[PDB]
Amino acid sequence: SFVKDFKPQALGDTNLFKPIKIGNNELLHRAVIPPLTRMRALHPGNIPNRDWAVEYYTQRAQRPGTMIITEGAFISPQAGGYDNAPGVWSEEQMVEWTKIFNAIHEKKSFVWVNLWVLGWAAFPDNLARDGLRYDSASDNVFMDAEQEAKAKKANNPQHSLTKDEIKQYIKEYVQAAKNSIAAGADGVEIHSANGYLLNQFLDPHSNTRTDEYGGSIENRARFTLEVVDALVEAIGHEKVGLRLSPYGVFNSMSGGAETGIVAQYAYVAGELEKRAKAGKRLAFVHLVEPRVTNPFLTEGEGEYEGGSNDFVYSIWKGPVIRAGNFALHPEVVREEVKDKRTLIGYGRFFISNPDLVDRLEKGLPLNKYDRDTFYQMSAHGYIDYPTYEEALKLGWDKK
Ligand SMILES: Cc1cc2nc3c(=O)[nH]c(=O)nc-3n(C[C@H](O)[C@H](O)[C@H](O)COP(=O)(O)O)c2cc1C
Ligand SMILES: O=Cc1ccc(O)cc1
Ligand SMILES: [Mg+2]
């Protein structure tokens, strides 16, 4: 069924359809497909699903010039924690990723691998079985109730990373970046948002360390910036991007309740622009809008109207991607794109609408999404969403 009770508006006359250059890529529009974990990866091996992945990315790369950010990809086994999420550390995975990247490039679109490390969001028992640690910034603060519950059951206490163990994660990031780029990826997006490892260090609630990785704005941000510095020196600054969620509360992050959250991120943004002048300007900065502080709550819930991301624009002067409930609000996108360096990320509706860009340009009805197949091990709810034409033939509008 099409989304009922929604007035679609054509966005063909806005900047959403004026090309832009992000890195080495020349996009033909600014509707970006943000990272979306679907959990179809194969176990054992965290292998990209061999039966359905290529088709999935291929469907959503039909509109030429589209920029696609792959689903979260584990840089290594320790950075992992979910049986069905893909990784980019083994030869057996890179062989799969290549087929996807080629399928994507052939449609004339672009792909960026999102580097993922779970921190305290990983399953402790899944880590105990394979003989891995349950990492995080600290060891006296746990994500929640059932996480500290699984920690004990598996006799796998939450571990406060040591300086040498952080250095290791930085070595795996580089390797993963290198594998992805070697397999033909256009670039990689450092995932430093939604309460994962790097965000756990960034947030003052999950980071109560005393060494140079906690204790102040400058220290809580050290990890993220070292990773940025490392990937910039290894594959080029035009092939790297950083994702942040200043006001997110997902996974026990502080959000706007922490008075120093704006300063924490203003700092990071400041360090980027700094490097930008030094010649090394990241390809872009990706921001999750306070319009969505929790990606698990329906469109309109968990909105934080006490803060804004606009401050980033006074510090960083490169491309900025903004994502969060923009598909059902064309009126807000029309205003946000009047800025010449802003890109719009459409998550949940790029899941259900494979031809989303066309529907945005022509103001057509959007396919409602099925939340139940977001993480199912099936093709249903993954690759069987119809395009507008297919929907008409199937009679989704009622004669
Ligand atoms: C099913 C699902 C999977 C997601 N997977 C990821 C992910 O792997 N990495 C990430 O950074 N964000 C992820 N997100 C968050 C989205 O990138 C996005 O910020 C969020 O969905 C808000 O956009 P939307 O309102 O257009 O869906 C996911 C969201 C959903 C609903
Ligand atoms: O729903 C899965 C998910 C994964 C990573 C994120 O960052 C956010 C959501
Ligand atoms: Mg008909």
Coordinates of C-alpha atoms in Angstrom, one line a residue, residues 22 30 49-50 62-63 77 133-134 150 159 194 212 288 335 351 360 367 380 389 391:
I22 CA 31.3 14.8 -3.0
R30 CA 21.4 15.2 -3.6
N49 CA 24.2 -12.3 1.6
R50 CA 25.1 -14.1 -1.6
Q62 CA 18.9 2.8 -10.6
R63 CA 18.8 6.6 -10.7
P77 CA 35.8 -9.7 14.5
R133 CA 35.9 -9.0 24.5
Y134 CA 32.9 -6.9 25.3
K150 CA 23.9 -10.7 29.2
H159 CA 36.0 -4.0 29.2
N194 CA 24.2 6.4 17.3
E212 CA 43.9 11.1 27.4
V288 CA 21.5 12.7 12.0
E335 CA 13.9 24.8 2.8
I351 CA 14.1 0.7 2.1
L360 CA 10.7 12.8 -5.1
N367 CA 5.4 2.9 -0.7
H380 CA 10.5 -10.5 1.5
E389 CA 5.1 1.4 -12.3
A391 CA 2.8 -0.7 -8.0

